[PDB]
Amino acid sequence: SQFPYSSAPLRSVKEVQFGLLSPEEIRAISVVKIEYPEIMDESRQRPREGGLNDPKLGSIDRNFKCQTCGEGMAECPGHFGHMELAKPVFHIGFIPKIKKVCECICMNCGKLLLDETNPTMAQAIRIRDPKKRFNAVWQLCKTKMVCEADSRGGCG
Amino acid sequence: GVPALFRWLSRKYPKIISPVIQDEDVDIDGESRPTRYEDPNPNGELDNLYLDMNGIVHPCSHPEHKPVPETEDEMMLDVFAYTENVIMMARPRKVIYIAVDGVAPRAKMNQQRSRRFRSAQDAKDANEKKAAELKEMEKKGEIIDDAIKNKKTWDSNAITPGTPFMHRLADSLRYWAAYKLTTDPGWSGIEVIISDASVPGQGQHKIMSYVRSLRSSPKHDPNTTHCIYGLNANLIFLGLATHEPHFKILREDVFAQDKKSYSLQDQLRMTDIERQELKDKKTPFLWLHLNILREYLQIELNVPGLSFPFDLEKSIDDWVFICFFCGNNFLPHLPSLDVRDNSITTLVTIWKQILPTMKGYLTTDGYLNLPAVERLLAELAKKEDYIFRKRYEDEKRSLENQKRRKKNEEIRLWEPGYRKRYYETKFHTKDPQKVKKIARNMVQKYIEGVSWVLLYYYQGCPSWNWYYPYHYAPFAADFVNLSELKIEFVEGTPFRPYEQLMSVLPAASSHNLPDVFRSLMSDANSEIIDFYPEEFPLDMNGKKVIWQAIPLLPFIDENRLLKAVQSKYDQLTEDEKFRNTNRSEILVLGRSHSHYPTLVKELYEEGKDSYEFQVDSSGVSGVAIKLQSFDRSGVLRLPVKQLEGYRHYPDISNRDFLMVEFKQLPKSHAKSMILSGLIPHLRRLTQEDKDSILYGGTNFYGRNRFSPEENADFKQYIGPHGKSQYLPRQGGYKAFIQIHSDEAKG
């Protein structure tokens, strides 16, 4: 009850939804773009604008308040930024799973090697749980090694 | 950086300073609503607003950081915009008093002359260095436009009554007031009083005199609320002299105003988009409430153990007198009491140490009590040994720290018998009898000067001819046998605008002054050539600021200066003679105002020469006189050439407003006490600062931020909360009912 009063209603978390952050969402939630390698300007405080310690990111000291939320370090939860990459980079935690996807879809038309015509694939589709459904699809589609031209839209 | 005399009241009274609710500006896309006047003021309702117009026109004549406007039409438009913003921020609903500093009295004349001389000198040095740099980079190949070569720096000495610029400013202010009254639906019930530079007086003095004249009417409402806008901090002590609790001061913000120094490159070649951004940069403002200050001083000054009943009004008067004694423009500060406001910190405690023993108050309705101030100064002299020891110890400790980390003066005040050596250092006289006589005369003149200063802000100007004939002041123990001294004043007559123009303007800033008197500064055969030397000595007295040093100058001789001035009235034209006269205030009244039909009937219909007001709808009081030059069938045009995109001003017909000559009520001996029927504001101090200002409980805990945002409401604490003059207390019937109703409920 020591927090300052807020007009927003207070409740409790009832559901937690997990997922991946899309690049559009990452750009939207960000408040500043980080592009300058340097930290200080000429070593007289006043950190670099757009650097790793931009004042818009947040406030960690009572001398300067946050430039985005306007509160001190006791209330500001911190604000995220975005950094654009020149080339795409793999995710180390997603190295194997992507490869598994590479064994499921075609590398030219981006289509699955098997369709609903196959009976085993048809049964594997009806699995409600995504994890075991994906496991079954990968196990069934890793055996075939050629994209079928016929149609299913395959490139042959 | 916050200045002194204001940082101290931030430290000691942090709770009176409040921020301002600026505006709302644009809400919908494209153009938006202009925030019409009739909406309630979020800062609290305000009736009377008194504007110190000189403090509005001077910084928006030469901004320090904002790039300098060119020409003078843009200057007038900028003044119009700033005044409109200030009025919309304060939102007065009864009276706007536009007061411009007129002909100053003789007491301030020496300071005025020093300030004008320094302004001319450093402006000349600055433009000489600027031209040298222009030539230097011309040798480097830089291109300079004609708007920068021929156009020199604007002379700040032009802010002086009698110059054509003041006439243009007065005409522009009259036109702007008439236009605002005739086009704004929210200004229908407002009377605008203009007291331009033609009217003798000085700004805040005119405001104080008007408030005093208002208080002299028995029908005056004591619940009216006043506000003063001004850059001078002394107004903080001026409002407490009015003894009107519903009082406040609007000031430019100092804490949050991160003033960044800008060079000429940040003025000349910076872009027009940034020009508009700086124009639209909402400068924060501070509300400084004086009722909260009175609440603080009611508890602070309530020292126990007194042989006489405690009166908060006389204590307020004594506190204001001490504050004026510590520092004022008319008299130089004492040698002992120095480092500005810390002196105020000292004497008050001295007063607290001497009040129980003394039987009488220091001042009574602006009149000094000689024995009381004499014993106060005697105790100050007794402590002068410790004060001099402390300040010289601070100086020597600064010298030691500097050593560790890295007219001839040489007085050495730490040695005994420093008074005589200081006397021959400042006077070059070794005769003990002459030194004693000079010291006695200086003491008598300084007593007369503090009396003059205290009467000036309390009972009007007592003498327009008095002036301090020295450059320094004696120490406290020189003030002995003060009851024997006699003080007398002669009212005299205020000087003509041309006389003050002669007195304060230098020889290097005579372009604005008419060519008739130019030979009185330029010709070497002139009999008054000696009052304007090219260079003058400066006595530092020990400091580092250039202009804070003593400006050693030949004192003006009044008699022959007068003779020279009156020897050359026959060469002036009709307009120059009309600019060399003193007139009365101007009252401007709307067509839809309730007082308009009555004034028209009593002036332009009944043929009467004068009409008496007393209390009216707008709360003014005085005498209205028909003004001959005002033709009702004419058209009032803007005296300023219109620039691009500055809110095009149409031509105002004279049938839509009335302009009359205004006089105040006859002068009377004003008392220092609250009127009957006053409704106190809602109590704002709650059992924390009340004992913090008394004991050491959370008083020295330094919170070095002092941001005014900690209150952020300042709304219910403005108007006269309640409907009873006397608050419930002890065993009154209504109080009894209230307290037992509360007890039954809880």
Binding site: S1, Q2 | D691, Y695, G697, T698, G746
Partner: protein, 169 residues
């Protein structure tokens, strides 16, 4: 009384949440409390506190006790609660937690209280019993050839808190 003298208080919480420190408040002798305020008083007698020894193998290793303020710097324990805590007095260190709300005080008093934990659900048998010297003592006390004179009987009867005041034949 102040924070330096027991019993006393440390802080005074206003209705709006402002805190007054009694250490720096030297004029606390003439302060009045308002209804709805909170006073952070010292730990008094009969205050339920959680009391724990690590590692906590089972629920009996963390129980609610009643505070008795005593001199010296060691926690005092009954000898019968050492076995559920699996503790001895050769240098053991134990922890104490103070609830800060009425609901959690009631929860500790009605759920985690020591008397409610005498019988454990692991083997439907008690986990606290008469141990160490007392046990040996009763073996030397209830022997057939043990006889007590009148004065010692009166002293022992008075030593019983739950004695009914009737001397048996």
């Amino acid at each position: 009384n102040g924070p330096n003298e027991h019993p006393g208080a440390k802080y005074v919480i206003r209705d709006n949440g402002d805190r007054i420190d009694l250490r720096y408040h030297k004029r606390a002798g003439d302060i009045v409390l308002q209804y709805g305020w909170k006073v952070e008083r010292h730990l008094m007698d009969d205050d339920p506190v959680l009391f724990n020894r690590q590692p906590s193998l089972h629920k009996m290793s963390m129980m609610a006790h009643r505070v008795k303020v005593m001199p010296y710097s060691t926690f005092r324990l009954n000898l019968s609660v050492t076995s559920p805590y699996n503790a001895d007095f050769d240098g053991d260190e134990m922890n104490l937690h103070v609830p800060q709300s009425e609901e959690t005080r009631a929860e500790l008093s009605q759920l985690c209280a020591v008397p409610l934990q005498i019988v454990s659900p692991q083997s439907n048998k008690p986990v606290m019993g008469i141990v160490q010297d007392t046990l040996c003592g009763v073996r030397k006390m209830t022997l057939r050839d043990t006889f007590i004179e009148y004065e010692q009987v009166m002293n022992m009867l008075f030593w019983v808190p739950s004695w009914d005041g009737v001397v048996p034949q």
